[PDB]
Point group: C3
Chain length 189, copies 3
């Protein structure tokens, strides 16, 4: 792969920590509820949850590095801003999940579009699209299996929240940026 | 006019779609209520509402092109970001309309100032001022006529919401940017 | 000092006005309650409150000018954006203070990180750290003395809100920027 093992591990850990914060926010606000008592939990989440999101973070970053022209001008400052934007949007969905679906979903779409406008390129958007489809699909399957459920006022997309689509999209854009950063920050002459 | 018909139509449609999303958000949250049963509705709005906002969008864009030095460096990326900022702010007012007037209005003013800081110039601000006056004035007249009303906790500006002033201001700044974009994106040598 | 008296006064007034707006927002939403009837109030605040924040604004700006390489490229546009970001974040804490501590605090941390990413440098962050410690410390002492109290759902940091840490941090970053602006905007050849 294009990522070095150490970079992949850092990205995995970054995704896992952000996932735990966001997922705890969803649980504590009643946005979601788990129904899987048999597995070990880490904070408010089944142990496999931060593993899934962490793995997706490293995978989307790797994917970007296989797409045309990774940007060499990416900085830690841009990456911090992107992570903050995704974390901020994630926790905001926990705060507003009980409100009507259109304004809630529109707000998250606006946040995602602005994140792309500031940080994203074409291949980054493509990564955003990939996870905007796979992310909600995995969740829909999990909900179907009874692993967890969304609050009844946040389950309009086949049992999951419509805001997942732009939330995952923004995640993909930023993970792609993190992959570009991993390469760009390597030692130079 | 400086805009070509096709550009004016695209801007009109853009404004109309964004207006319908925002106005549906206000209606579904109880920010506003219509009292005009005799006219055809489009989604949650009287059919003339998206026409008014769409027309204002094309008109403010046209106005900018009659003001000094339209910027030739404007991009679709900046325009998407501006539309997202205005849509995001519009739907946020629906979410927070029941809160006390000062923090709500201050939040919208902050959003509008940041939108200008990132995207606006002097003439863009002037367009923002024009609609920040005309917009609320039209609404105040409509409310006076009994066409619709604001929620009692959001009607402190002669029967309409004080947040309309910075919301319209930000709309004007972005419409002006869209006018500049319309010209800048034309085919070049 | 590096600031001229007139610049220090403008910064003091700017901080005082923003403090009064934010503090009124906290009082009117029940985020905080004062228990000091013997002193003259200005709007919703004890008269010494805007003096404290105004003084901190001028002091942090002055401090930045004693740290390495004040940036000469700072503009009024950047400064307006920074003030808007801090005011917007301040009033948002009033709106969301009743929600669970983790998502609320994470949202404010995200806002602060983005503010730094867009506007801050190393010395600006250092100023942010200074007030992120001193600010909450002063508040903790004041609460201990019974001068005011936080809402029971917003008092987890020794009697004050955990969101104060990133809120003050962002304040420090922007005050530092205002100090740089004060010097940069002086008449040039
Ligand atoms: C997203 C941030 C990723 C951080 C990855 C940290 C590990 O990467 C390695 O960091 C070393 C120290 O800088 C370099 O010597 C090396 O070449 C690089 O491969
Ligand atoms: C991966 O582990 C599995 O996770 C499921 C969901 O938590 C459990 O239903 C199951 O028992 C457990 O094996
Ligand atoms: C909602 C997402 C917001 C994330 C914050 C964006 C990162 C902030 C820093 O960005 C960078 O700032 C520099 C100074 O202007 C520019 O030189 C550079 O080109 C730009 O990329
Ligand atoms: C705001 C976005 C506005 C989009 C306007 C689309 C119509 O405009 C036209 O688009 C053609 C195709 O690009 C150009 O050939 C032509 O010169 C231009 O007038
Ligand atoms: C423009 O149309 C008018 O709109 C008004 C407001 O909806 C109606 O009161 C009126 O009947 C109708 O003619
Ligand atoms: C709250 C409103 C936020 C809207 C989002 C702003 C548009 C994002 C892209 O902007 C543009 O990004 C480029 C990369 O830095 C710069 O080269 C350019 O000069 C700048 O204009
Ligand atoms: C933060 C904004 C600070 C505004 C400070 C205004 C006072 O400063 C003074 O403004 C004069 C007029 O521009 C200059 O002639 C002078 O040299 C400068 O010292
Ligand atoms: C500074 O003034 C002091 O402020 C305190 C807090 O408001 C009062 O307790 C005290 O009486 C008053 O002297
Ligand atoms: C959440 C905090 C957001 C505050 C808003 C940031 C200030 C907006 C203007 O910034 C400036 O815009 C210019 C145009 O791109 C750049 O030339 C310049 O380098 C950049 O610094
Ligand atoms: C890098 C930040 C982590 C990305 C999080 C992506 C969204 C996960 C949403 C999980 N779902 C709400 O349960
Ligand atoms: C709660 C489920 C969250 C799933 C997030 C997306 C995982 C995709 C798997 C990528 N490997
Ligand atoms: C381009 C986006 C559309 C601009 C909307 C401007 C504000 C309209 C507010 C209508 N009012 C709240 O009923
Ligand atoms: C509900 C009324 C909204 C009015 C928006 C501003 C229209 C101004 C008319 C411009 N022509
Ligand atoms: C320049 C804007 C003013 C900075 C405000 C800094 C935070 C003060 C918080 C006061 N505390 C919540 O009571
Ligand atoms: C309500 C107390 C707010 C205190 C804000 C920080 C003041 C630090 C004093 C700097 N001199």
């Amino acid at each position: 792969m294009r990522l070095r093992i150490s970079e992949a591990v850092v990205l995995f850990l970054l995704g896992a920590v952000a996932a735990l914060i966001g997922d705890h926010s969803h649980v504590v606000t009643g946005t979601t509820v788990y129904h899987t008592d048999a597995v070990p939990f880490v904070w408010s989440s089944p142990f496999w949850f931060p593993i899934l999101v962490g793995a997706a973070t490293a995978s989307l970053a790797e994917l970007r590095l296989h797409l045309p022209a990774p940007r060499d001008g990416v900085t830690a400052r841009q990456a911090l801003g992107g992570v903050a934007a995704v974390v901020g949007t994630y926790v905001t969905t926990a705060l507003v999940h009980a409100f009507p679906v259109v304004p809630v979903t529109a707000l998250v779409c606006a946040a995602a579009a602005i994140t792309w406008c500031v940080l994203g390129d074409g291949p980054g958007a493509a990564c955003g699209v990939v996870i905007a489809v796979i992310g909600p699909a995995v969740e829909i399957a999990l909900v179907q299996l009874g692993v967890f459920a969304y609050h009844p006022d946040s389950d309009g997309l086949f049992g999951v929240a419509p805001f997942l689509a732009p939330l995952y999209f923004a995640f993909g854009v930023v993970a792609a940026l993190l992959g570009e950063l991993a390469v760009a920050r390597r030692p130079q002459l």
